[PDB]
Amino acid sequence: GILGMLHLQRMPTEFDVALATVFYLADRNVTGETFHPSGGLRFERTVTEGELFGKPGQQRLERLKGSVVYLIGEHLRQHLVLLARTFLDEIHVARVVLLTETTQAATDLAAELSDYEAAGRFVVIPTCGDIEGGIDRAMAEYGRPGPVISTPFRPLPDRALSARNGDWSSVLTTAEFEELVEQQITHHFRVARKAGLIEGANVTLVTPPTSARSTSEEFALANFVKTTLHALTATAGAESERTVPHVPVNQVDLTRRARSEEPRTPSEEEEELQRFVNAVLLTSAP
Amino acid sequence: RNADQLEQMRASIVREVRDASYPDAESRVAIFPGSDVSDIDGLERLVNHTVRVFGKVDYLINNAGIAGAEEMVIDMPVDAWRHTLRANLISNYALLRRLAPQMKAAGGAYVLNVSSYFGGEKYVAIPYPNRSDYAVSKAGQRAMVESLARFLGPEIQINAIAPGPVEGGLFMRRARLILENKRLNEVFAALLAARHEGATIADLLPDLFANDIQSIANSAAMPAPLRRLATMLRETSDAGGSAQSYLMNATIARKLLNRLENGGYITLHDRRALTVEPPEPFFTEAQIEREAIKVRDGILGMLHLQRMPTEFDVALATVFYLADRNVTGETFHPSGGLRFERTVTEGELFGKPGQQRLERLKGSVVYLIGEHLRQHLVLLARTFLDEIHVARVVLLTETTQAATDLAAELSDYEAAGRFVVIPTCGDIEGGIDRAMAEYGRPGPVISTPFRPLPDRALSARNGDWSSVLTTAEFEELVEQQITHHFRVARKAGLIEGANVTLVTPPTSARSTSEEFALANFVKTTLHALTATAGAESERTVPHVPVNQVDLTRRARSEEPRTPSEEEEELQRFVNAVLLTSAPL
Amino acid sequence: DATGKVILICAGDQVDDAVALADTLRSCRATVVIGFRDPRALEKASVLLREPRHALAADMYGRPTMTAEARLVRLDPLDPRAAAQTLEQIHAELGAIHHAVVLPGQSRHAPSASLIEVDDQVVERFLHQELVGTIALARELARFWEEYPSGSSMHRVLFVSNPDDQQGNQYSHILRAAVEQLVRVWRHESEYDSVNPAHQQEGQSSAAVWANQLIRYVNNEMANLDFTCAWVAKLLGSDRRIAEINLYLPEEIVGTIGVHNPGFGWAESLFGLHMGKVALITGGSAGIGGQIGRLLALSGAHVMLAA
């Protein structure tokens, strides 16, 4: 299987890669780039970056009527409340499940979504960091996960709001980076693994923070989270087709790599939100 | 190309290598005076001389370079574009093909295609305005590598090099050029705005070229936009230059008139020279210096290390890279790291015609070409007329026989002039001029190629070099699959409301592996061309958005499975075309 | 560099030393012609060279080269009219020959390390086949060079001496004294005769000769048969004109300058790159990181291996 993807049909040894790395170490004119000491492989790429224009397909729209959809998250309050409104009005979903990791946000979301209290579709539960237990209870309540909606409970830490400084006192430290990795990368893996365990629980990972170059030490932060979720979905996607259970893993990101991207327009981001609601209603399940 | 410079550098290099303690007999180096690279037939003499003095060829460095005429796409003449492409792209394959049969028996072969980082990078076509040819011909130099590494085989290696801004001219010529283009821009915008509301250039041209802004402002017998432009020039512009009193120059006059001629704004027999010659100080040096500082700072702000590399560093990195025996078909970056505003290929971005959007271009004129994919064209015509109810459709055809075949194929949309056909005989200019004269002025032009792929083999070992794709075929492929797109886009660039949409052939069904490399070549080269053109068409007063669309690698992925199931691609083609043809 | 050059090794019964010299010269991508003085030694040399150890040429970086294999001829210095015939035969086979490494006749010139106990039984063989033999070979080569003038660099004739096993090398001393002068007087005569129009008109223009010696009987170590190969291959394949006749190895190799070169030119190129810098490596005990640490320490930096 290997050595059949090599153009020269010759496997390099450790000496060649070590020599190339040592010779590259003395460039003194490059930074922020990936080197390739010895590689001519043919795997190409089954996954590449794409975009979306909108206009959801009508054929793949009514097939989700009378189904069950699982969504998590609390930080994007308006996004979720509208999501529920769209899922109940146009999607006409039979059951909507919402996961919350604290009680104050649970009460706030209940107050926000009391418009559907008479229907009783929306369900809010005070979960905690044990996200595995929470989803297990969510599925034990009724049904099984379907169009799993991935959403970080809290936005990226960026607690110190600095990737570098001049005094080295108010910069993102090791503890905050560990928290960021545990909440923005490991959390997605935990949710997806559970989603994969339930066959048909197609999980769609999303990168809510649309950080822009205008936000210093935040744009590239958005860039890294995107790239890491890309890596996660890439490998996971390979294991889902050959294995009996069918759980397509999709990653949708809104923090476009367009430098400032959208400008600071007050009350003129509803179009970007509508683009998001379109992106989430697409993909996932038909 | 020159002799004295080559002699001096050979003297220096031979002195350096003599100090390097080699058994030198002045045989390690050689010269070839007048080895111009823009002529193809003269390369064989160079190859024969090389294999006579030395014996063979092992390292081939394709470093011939041509900056180009250095103007915008919408300004270039075809001859300059052809010269740039021939002296920059085709000259690589010419030598490569002439040396490959002997190269195979060597085993230590290496081909280096020195490119420019501003040409592009894999999966991202970075822009580089005002140097379109220098981007197309530098993207091609790595598209060839990526498409040929697999087939060249184990004995031969092939890579590329992409150095960005390298320096230890001050952009004075560049400053003068950007100022002049700015001039062509506001003048062209003025006339456009004037002709936009009940005016014609016919009566506007005689007093226009008088280069008397005072007279223009005082007379007031002319449309407002040029008067406001003259007033703005009177206020803002510097007072220490002829521009303060005169408007045109010996260059921005003929070029601008030509722009209008090419765009169809001004008919023939309406061209004259300048009655008044503005004095020597047309532009105050201070402006040149300020533009030079601005350009420099804008260029230097993209570096991460806040400094520029020198030729020595990139040469050293390339020379150390040449010793790698395990890398093929990859682009190296000898000294890089920069901030760019680039674009990334979507790879079949999802999208459909959204309701309440359509019928915008209803009762309008649409533009298409092609003779290779007849069923595709007829399908487009049917989908354009059944739903949109287009007022006029123009489909130019390379040959008259295909025109008659198309007429018989449709045979039902006639008697109204909607289904109008016309021969081309390889002259796009004649057909487009007839279209601009008798037919309307369609916006969404489509660069559908007239002829199919070369459909031949390019991989073989020593002793079998007859059926291989030779330099003649390669030149034909470049002319019909790259230069054709440039010609169509540039000639349709100078149109108000144009929606140029480049389309590369979706190859065919049951395709071999050899012809799955020319496709990638076309992909990359057209990507660079459309990126540069779209970047240029944003600043340019008129904005003609160019959008490239290809249907290759779309569920095919070199996997042969095509029993019926044509309706998928039939619907995908119209979905994509209608989606990219309708902005907003 | 010896790509377009042909090196003929004037060997003798010394199969091991001559074959080692042939390997170290073929490592410089050059064809060789190994001529053996005494009979009954050609077949042993052929059997030894058949093995892939000496039948494959690899350059100083460790990369194999497809250089021409080692030819084998029979030469009889003491016997004229046959050595000249073989010289003209190898001329017709290949062309002119310019590099001639001249080794002595026998390994040990006598079984006993003495000079006065003998009664003219083996010293006659010595003085007749290893001094005269050398003189005959020198003229055999001089005639090939002058009878057939060839415009090129100066002619190179090394005169490697025998190694030491025990009781020193009294005979090596004798040959050395005879050689230094032969090289000295010759070099002079040759350079003087390269400008005279009288001898220049004979055929085409000829070239001068520059010869040396590479005494080894003073160093008794394990790398003296690899140091000697380095010095023979450096005075032939390069443009370095020694102004002194006799060259001598150091009484201690690692003692003065210990360098080990198993074809490791990469580590020589990676010298002093990252000098005076401290590096911290993670898992640098086995694998890619270990090799990076190895090459960085060889570069000059400071490393801190942790696993």
Side-chain angles (χ1 to χ4, degrees), chain A residues 44 46-54 56-58:
Chain A
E44 298 284 347
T46 320
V47 202
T48 321
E49 191 274 348
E51 296 274 37
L52 158 73
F53 271 97
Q58 195 40 256

Side-chain angles (χ1 to χ4, degrees), chain A residues 7-10 12 23 27-31 33 35 37-40 42 49-54 213, chain B residues 150 154 157 304-305 307 309 320 324-328 332-334 336-337 339 344 346 350 352 354:
Chain A
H7 293 161
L8 275 204
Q9 280 127 20
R10 291 197 280 134
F23 266 117
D27 210 337
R28 285 278 292 159
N29 233 320
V30 63
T31 181
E33 183 178 2
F35 189 43
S38 285
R42 206 190 303 228
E49 191 274 348
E51 296 274 37
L52 158 73
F53 271 97
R213 188 173 182 88
Chain B
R150 171 205 279 94
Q157 293 196 185
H304 284 165
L305 272 193
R307 44 173 162 149
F320 265 117
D324 224 340
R325 291 228 82 215
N326 294 280
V327 200
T328 325
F332 188 46
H333 293 103
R339 298 162 222 205
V344 54
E346 287 117 0
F350 273 81
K352 292 301 169 300

Side-chain angles (χ1 to χ4, degrees), chain C residues 102-116:
Chain C
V102 170
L103 291 73
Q106 285 79 1
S107 183
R108 293 182 183 174
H109 307 181
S112 67
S114 182
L115 302 186
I116 208 179

Side-chain angles (χ1 to χ4, degrees), chain B residues 15-91 93-170 172-181 184-191 193-211 213-217 219-226 228-231 233-234 236-260 262-264 269-279 281-332:
Chain B
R15 183 181 339 125
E16 290 211 64
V17 68
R18 194 207 300 283
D19 308 1
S21 80
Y22 276 130
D24 68 282
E26 250 284 351
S27 160
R28 316 274 221 186
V29 282
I31 317 294
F32 217 73
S35 77
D36 171 30
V37 202
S38 41
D39 52 347
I40 287 314
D41 312 298
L43 310 177
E44 279 68 16
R45 330 198 313 271
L46 156 69
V47 182
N48 282 335
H49 183 290
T50 319
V51 310
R52 188 175 75 235
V53 296
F54 279 109
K56 49 177 190 172
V57 161
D58 274 9
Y59 284 148
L60 187 36
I61 287 134
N62 287 300
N63 196 347
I66 297 295
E70 317 184 35
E71 320 97 331
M72 304 172 303
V73 177
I74 78 165
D75 261 342
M76 201 95 67
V78 190
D79 270 17
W81 166 260
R82 266 194 219 94
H83 189 303
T84 317
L85 258 64
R86 177 147 36 226
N88 291 344
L89 186 39
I90 292 123
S91 156
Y93 196 48
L95 274 77
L96 172 67
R97 175 102 186 74
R98 273 283 318 168
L99 275 306
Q102 177 248 290
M103 265 217 174
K104 289 298 233 275
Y110 208 119
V111 179
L112 204 87
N113 286 341
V114 158
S115 177
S116 175
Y117 194 13
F118 293 90
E121 201 26 74
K122 200 171 160 79
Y123 297 122
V124 293
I126 76 182
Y128 192 25
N130 275 49
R131 268 194 175 182
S132 44
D133 43 60
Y134 200 76
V136 173
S137 100
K138 286 319 203 180
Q141 259 162 282
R142 68 163 170 90
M144 152 192 315
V145 169
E146 302 172 356
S147 317
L148 196 85
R150 171 205 279 94
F151 288 81
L152 259 187
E155 295 85 357
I156 306 184
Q157 293 196 185
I158 173 156
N159 290 276
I161 294 295
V166 47
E167 208 54 45
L170 222 65
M172 289 275 166
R173 285 90 53 222
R174 315 259 142 104
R176 206 186 303 126
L177 281 153
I178 166 62
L179 287 150
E180 297 209 4
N181 319 341
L184 293 170
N185 305 328
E186 322 98 322
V187 183
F188 204 115
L191 187 279
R195 83 158 272 187
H196 213 167
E197 281 79 38
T200 298
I201 182 52
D203 195 16
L204 261 56
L205 52 96
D207 199 20
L208 187 32
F209 299 74
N211 52 83
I213 39 186
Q214 307 297 10
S215 318
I216 286 152
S219 43
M222 35 209 66
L226 56 104
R228 334 192 191 81
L229 151 62
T231 301
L233 260 157
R234 181 177 65 83
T236 39
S237 64
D238 194 45
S242 305
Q244 181 68 2
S245 35
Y246 302 86
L247 181 63
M248 263 143 273
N249 192 31
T251 80
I252 39 185
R254 44 176 178 85
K255 293 179 179 179
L256 214 171
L257 199 155
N258 299 354
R259 295 177 61 185
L260 307 176
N262 283 11
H269 71 76
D270 304 333
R271 181 177 181 170
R272 300 178 180 180
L274 271 202
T275 79
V276 180
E277 181 46 89
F282 192 63
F283 279 107
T284 302
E285 174 56 19
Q287 291 150 317
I288 319 288
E289 289 284 351
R290 182 203 307 166
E291 275 280 5
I293 294 169
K294 255 187 48 62
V295 169
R296 177 57 183 182
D297 278 359
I299 285 315
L300 208 37
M302 310 175 183
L303 268 291
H304 284 165
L305 272 193
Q306 317 272 265
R307 44 173 162 149
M308 271 165 158
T310 299
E311 293 177 350
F312 194 86
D313 324 286
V314 305
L316 193 67
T318 57
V319 163
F320 265 117
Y321 195 44
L322 254 62
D324 224 340
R325 291 228 82 215
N326 294 280
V327 200
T328 325
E330 190 81 58
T331 306
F332 188 46

Side-chain angles (χ1 to χ4, degrees), chain C residues 1-65 67-128 130-151 154-164 166 168-180 182-199 202-220 223-251 253-307:
Chain C
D1 215 12
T3 84
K5 284 202 191 263
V6 286
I7 295 100
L8 170 148
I9 300 171
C10 296
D13 84 281
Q14 293 277 55
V15 192
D16 322 74
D17 309 358
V19 163
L21 263 47
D23 209 348
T24 207
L25 271 292
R26 269 172 71 233
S27 305
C28 312
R29 60 194 41 71
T31 85
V32 300
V33 185
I34 317 178
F36 296 76
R37 174 191 290 265
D38 87 312
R40 307 169 58 179
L42 184 42
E43 98 189 8
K44 324 152 81 183
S46 64
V47 170
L48 184 45
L49 161 68
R50 159 164 314 132
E51 291 185 27
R53 296 202 47 248
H54 304 105
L56 191 44
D59 65 348
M60 291 315 148
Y61 289 74
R63 325 181 288 212
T65 36
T67 313
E69 216 187 60
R71 293 193 40 69
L72 299 94
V73 316
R74 181 177 65 83
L75 208 163
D76 52 353
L78 63 96
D79 223 318
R81 187 193 47 84
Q85 233 163 13
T86 316
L87 287 175
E88 288 189 312
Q89 202 145 101
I90 66 200
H91 185 313
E93 289 211 13
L94 301 134
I97 39 184
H98 40 257
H99 295 344
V101 182
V102 170
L103 291 73
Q106 285 79 1
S107 183
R108 293 182 183 174
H109 307 181
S112 67
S114 182
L115 302 186
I116 208 179
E117 62 172 352
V118 168
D119 208 21
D120 272 315
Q121 317 292 168
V122 188
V123 317
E124 185 81 345
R125 188 230 64 74
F126 164 66
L127 193 136
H128 197 54
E130 228 159 45
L131 192 147
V132 192
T134 301
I135 308 179
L137 180 56
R139 305 283 62 84
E140 289 288 352
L141 267 158
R143 181 177 181 170
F144 178 96
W145 283 311
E146 309 300 345
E147 174 185 2
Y148 295 92
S150 182
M154 313 211 175
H155 294 304
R156 331 204 157 187
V157 188
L158 275 60
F159 268 86
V160 193
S161 179
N162 283 350
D164 48 354
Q166 186 173 355
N169 285 337
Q170 58 282 351
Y171 291 91
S172 297
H173 199 231
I174 314 300
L175 181 60
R176 165 212 50 83
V179 165
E180 52 192 13
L182 180 152
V183 162
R184 154 198 290 89
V185 59
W186 188 342
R187 215 153 52 159
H188 162 275
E189 302 156 316
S190 181
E191 183 71 294
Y192 257 33
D193 296 356
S194 38
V195 315
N196 278 11
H199 317 94
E202 309 153 347
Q204 316 290 336
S205 173
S206 42
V209 63
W210 209 267
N212 262 298
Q213 215 185 159
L214 202 163
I215 311 291
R216 322 152 50 221
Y217 65 79
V218 292
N219 179 209
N220 187 354
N224 82 327
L225 211 30
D226 180 41
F227 197 41
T228 297
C229 298
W231 278 116
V232 304
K234 193 52 182 187
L235 300 188
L236 288 184
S238 93
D239 221 320
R240 180 182 293 176
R241 183 174 308 177
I242 311 303
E244 327 269 3
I245 288 139
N246 287 354
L247 287 69
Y248 290 74
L249 273 66
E251 315 153 81
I253 310 274
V254 295
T256 302
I257 172 177
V259 177
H260 291 175
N261 45 8
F264 84 122
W266 287 121
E268 181 275 338
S269 64
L270 277 180
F271 269 163
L273 224 57
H274 321 93
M275 188 142 43
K277 296 203 198 264
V278 53
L280 170 54
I281 311 176
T282 59
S285 99
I288 285 199
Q291 293 283 323
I292 304 188
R294 158 196 175 183
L295 280 288
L296 261 156
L298 268 66
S299 187
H302 302 242
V303 290
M304 162 86 188
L305 325 177

